[PDB]
Design a protein around this motif. Structure first.
Motif, PDB file in Angstrom:
ATOM      1  N   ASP A  14      49.068 -12.690   5.668  1.00 52.19           N
ATOM      2  CA  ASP A  14      48.535 -11.549   6.390  1.00 52.19           C
ATOM      3  C   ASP A  14      49.681 -10.758   7.008  1.00 52.19           C
ATOM      4  OD1 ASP A  14      49.229 -13.548   8.103  1.00 52.19           O
ATOM      5  OD2 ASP A  14      47.492 -13.333   9.427  1.00 52.19           O
ATOM      6  N   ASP A  74      54.264 -11.627   9.467  1.00 47.24           N
ATOM      7  CA  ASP A  74      54.890 -12.410   8.416  1.00 47.24           C
ATOM      8  C   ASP A  74      56.159 -11.727   7.917  1.00 47.24           C
ATOM      9  OD1 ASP A  74      52.521 -13.665   8.845  1.00 47.24           O
ATOM     10  OD2 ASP A  74      51.907 -13.758   6.744  1.00 47.24           O
ATOM     11  N   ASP A 129      50.246  -9.974  10.216  1.00 46.04           N
ATOM     12  CA  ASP A 129      50.329 -10.198  11.650  1.00 46.04           C
ATOM     13  C   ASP A 129      51.723 -10.595  12.108  1.00 46.04           C
ATOM     14  OD1 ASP A 129      50.390 -12.662  10.455  1.00 46.04           O
ATOM     15  OD2 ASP A 129      49.062 -13.634  11.900  1.00 46.04           O
TER      16      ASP A 129
HETATM   17 MG   LIG Z   1      49.813 -14.426   9.821  1.00 40.15          MG
END
Ligand SMILES: [Mg+2]
Lengths: 49, 49, 200, 209, 236, 215
Positions: free
Chosen positions: C110, C114, C112
């Motif tokens: 995702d 990474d 968020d």
């Molecule tokens: Mg993540």
RNA sequence: AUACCCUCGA
């Protein structure tokens, strides 16, 4: 009562009631300007009075 | 509070598209949310060798 | 190199965004070789000066060296071969690596926070292996099961589901359309709802 | 000030009626503005002609059952919808079709009416009807004003546009308009784009200087 | 693009870079601007003492401080990719070493600030005492006014004495040397300020554990706007 | 194929304005309105402060004796200045004040071709010992130009030359005694006041004309 | 430019 103010320091006239006999008004507040923090971020204080 | 501020009581109203300029068929949620910025900037993450 | 990843919705499945500075640093010897071949630089000091000055002509040669040279992208924990796939980079403006939304499921990545490591294959064997075995289009089906892994995720699934719904009574219900083209013409003109029982 | 005004426009002809127009150098927000404006002009406001009404003898109602043709009434209406007809004489004409395989060329014609595709099949026999052709602006459904049928006046069948990033030497962050067209064949897509641009230009030619 | 134009999420980052004057075997390295084989523009950015002037924009690779170690150059330069504005320079010199000109200027500025602080602190209290005394006596008995004048003069003198004693104590607390590490002649450090603007890749979050990496910065037109015309700022 | 004539502009205030275009063919309201909204919000030439340097300052991360706000706040306050340029494009303005008081845009040095719209914009507050004397170089541009895209003691400012703040449009019917199928476009335009709404509409019209003339 | 410790992200 705040005596004088600027972006760097704050000077406060201490109330005669909450003061000793001599040296009535003495409270000099030195604001810390842009200073590196432990995380490399700025630490500065701004007057609000 | 919402009905006092002359805003929809449900908290939603139909927005207008920014490119085609046509109203969305169903109403979406819009409001002011306290967003943060974390100390994970891509400027410190971009490395190349 | 590595950077935070970012969803690129204007990317084809076989390509991925690559920041100007990362691409310029990674492909530095290729840029030097092309500069010497074109004669634009005589000594390697001049080539380094041009690449560090980011002269406008160095972007052309950077585009030429990037055109058909796939790169490898992998997440931190690579639990299966799908966790590193070859992408044909496209130069973008920023510091983050733009990823195709449909490969996030295979990467289990995702957006968020990474990060992804990028590697540049050098030998023609390496480039051909990247393009023929681990290009993102080659690995659609999961190696664990023949079911596909490059499949619509949350947002695109929501869009496709909302498109193909039905309303009992909606604007544009009832009339018949001579082709899908007429359906598109009626919908874009606003004379028919997106989900209205029609005949076509 | 000075804007990026591209002049290297190209029209990739992928079919006789389909084309893809590209416009590489454009400012950040202009691609969407131009594409949406052109799409709205082409699809909604583009003068043309199409049939609006039909009167098939023996079909009192739309859902009636008729004999002598392989298909039914709604298929006939859909086949009639696709006819590409140009009106050079007047903005009102009624044509008749009489046959007892029916094609578009089977319609009798005058000097004014011109059928672009005479091979467009209509019915298959084993048909005495008169249809009404009118001039309009865009897609006018029958509901919004057999005797009625949805009219597709605009000469374009499908308009879509996408914007992709365009790389300039030192700017490097711009947008590139890829607009694809497909007309009935009554106008070349290049001509349709020119007509749309001319109309939009006329919309604010009074105040430009 | 408003959130960048209105400059809402920009932040200031302060980072420091250091140089130490080691007691090298051949000799001590000196903080001098005559770096061997030094170019002119870079020397122009520097001062005569070998340190960047405060308030100078610095690009990557520029020479912030000049050290010559036997003559090889240990001059500090900024790391690659690091560009900012110099906001402060600090100088520490070992006890028994010569105090350079920049340290002198920094110190004189500091004692000037201190002097003016206690000057105004004396001014306010002496004004208060003087107006109190003048209000006590009638407009311009006899013994009382002279006694109060003598008391006010004594108080002013005592305040002056304690104030000057404090000033001298601060002065001497400034003149002392540092307890630097063995082999450290002079230690210098520069501070760089960077206005980091929010850009695609920066992690943003709310207060309910809704993380996110900013993807793109579209112009104001494309973002959804209300019927009244106000545009949204973030689409989640 | 009706076209609008005599662009109608209604002034609600110094900043907010309304523009109405009565004769417009059916369905053209939304197209023209969105095109104009994007053109105005994107590309409108305006002028804003691009360089400021003060006598007693070295870098923007410092403070000035007797000034209640630090230099960052002073520059941020300067960024909201709504100026208008009539003659050349780059000019330089001065601002020198001493003693207690409040420096506003009224205290900026006047000029022949330079006009100040928001003369009530507070820039800083001064104490008795406060004193600042600063020079403002302004420039006229089109879009947001950061400092990176554009001597010691000179401070560079991020500039957003766009003078338009909010654009709205509504399409209502227009009765010209010909037919009820006509419609009109009402542009609810709110700027900072440095550009006239009629001039903004004409400039948008020419920009759209050129971008269509690319065909 | 070697080893631990601490903190943080996925
Ligand atoms: Mg993540």
């Amino acid at each position: 009562v705040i005596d004088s103010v600027d972006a760097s320091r704050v000077v406060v006239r201490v109330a005669d009631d909450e003061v000793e006999t001599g040296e009535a008004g003495v409270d000099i507040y030195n604001l810390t300007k842009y200073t590196r923090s432990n995380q490399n971020t700025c630490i500065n204080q701004r007057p609000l009075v | 509070m919402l009905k006092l501020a002359d805003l929809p009581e449900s908290g939603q109203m139909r927005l207008f598209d920014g490119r085609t300029g046509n109203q969305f068929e169903r109403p979406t949620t819009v409001g002011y949310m306290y967003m943060l910025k974390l100390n994970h900037l891509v400027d410190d993450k971009m490395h190349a060798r | 190199g590595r950077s935070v990843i970012t969803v690129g919705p204007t990317l084809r499945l076989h390509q991925c965004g690559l920041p100007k500075k990362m691409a310029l640093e990674l492909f530095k010897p290729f840029i030097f070789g092309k500069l010497e071949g074109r004669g634009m630089a005589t000594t390697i000091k001049a080539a380094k000066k041009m690449v560090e000055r980011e002269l406008p002509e160095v972007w052309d040669v950077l585009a030429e060296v990037i055109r058909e040279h796939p790169v490898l992208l992998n997440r931190a924990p690579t639990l299966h071969r799908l966790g590193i796939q070859a992408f044909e980079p496209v130069l973008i403006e920023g510091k983050a690596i733009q990823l195709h939304p449909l490969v996030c499921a295979a990467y289990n990545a995702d957006f968020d926070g990474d990060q992804m490591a990028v590697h540049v294959p050098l030998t023609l064997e390496a480039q051909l292996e990247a393009r023929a075995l681990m290009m993102s289009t080659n690995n659609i089906l999961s190696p664990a099961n023949g079911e596909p892994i490059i499949v619509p995720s949350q947002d695109v699934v929501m869009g496709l589901y909302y498109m193909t719904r039905e309303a009992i009574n909606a604007k544009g219900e009832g009339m018949a359309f001579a082709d899908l083209q007429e359906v598109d013409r009626a919908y874009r003109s606003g004379q028919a709802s997106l989900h209205a029982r029609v005949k076509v | 000030n000075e804007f990026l005004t591209p002049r290297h426009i190209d029209v990739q002809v992928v079919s006789q009626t389909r084309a893809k127009i590209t416009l590489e150098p454009l400012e950040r927000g202009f691609g969407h503005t131009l594409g949406n404006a052109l799409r709205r002009i082409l699809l909604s406001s583009m003068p043309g002609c199409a049939v609006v009404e039909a009167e098939i003898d023996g079909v009192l109602h739309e859902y009636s059952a008729i004999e002598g043709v392989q298909e039914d009434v709604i298929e006939i209406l859909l086949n009639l919808k696709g006819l590409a007809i140009k009106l050079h004489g007047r903005d009102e004409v009624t044509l008749t079709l009489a046959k007892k395989v029916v094609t578009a060329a089977d319609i009798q014609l005058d000097h004014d009416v011109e059928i672009i595709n005479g091979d467009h099949v209509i019915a298959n026999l084993a048909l005495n009807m008169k249809l009404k052709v009118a001039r309009g602006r865009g897609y006018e459904p029958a509901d919004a004003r057999r005797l009625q049928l949805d009219a597709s006046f605009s000469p374009v069948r499908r308009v879509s546009y996408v914007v992709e990033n365009a790389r300039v030497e030192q700017r490097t962050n711009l947008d590139k308009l890829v607009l694809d067209l497909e007309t009935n064949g009554t106008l070349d897509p290049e001509e349709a784009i020119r007509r749309a641009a001319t109309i939009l230009q006329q919309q604010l030619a009074a105040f430009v200087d | 693009e408003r959130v960048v134009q209105e400059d809402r999420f920009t932040t200031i980052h302060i980072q420091e870079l250091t140089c130490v004057a080691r007691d090298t075997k051949l000799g001590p390295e000196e903080i001098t601007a005559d770096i061997p084989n030094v170019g002119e523009a870079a020397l122009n950015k520097l001062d005569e003492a070998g340190i960047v002037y405060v308030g100078a924009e610095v690009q990557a690779g520029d020479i912030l401080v000049g050290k010559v170690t036997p003559v090889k150059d240990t001059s500090l330069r900024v790391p690659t990719g690091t560009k900012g504005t110099v906001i402060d320079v600090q100088v520490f010199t070992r006890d028994g070493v010569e105090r350079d000109s920049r340290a002198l200027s920094i110190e004189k500025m500091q004692l000037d600030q201190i002097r003016k602080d206690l000057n105004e602190e004396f001014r306010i209290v002496e004004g208060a005492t003087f107006e109190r005394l003048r209000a006590a006596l009638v407009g311009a008995a006899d013994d009382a006014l002279n006694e109060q004048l003598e008391k006010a003069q004594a108080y002013i003198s005592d305040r002056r004495q304690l104030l000057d004693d404090k000033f001298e104590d601060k002065k001497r607390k400034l003149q002392q040397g540092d307890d630097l590490a063995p082999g450290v002649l002079k230690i210098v450090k520069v501070y760089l300020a960077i206005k980091r603007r929010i850009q695609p890749g920066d992690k943003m979050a709310g207060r309910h554990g809704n993380k996110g990496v900013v993807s793109v910065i579209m112009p104001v037109e494309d973002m959804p706007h209300d019927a009244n015309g106000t545009p949204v700022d973030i689409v989640l």
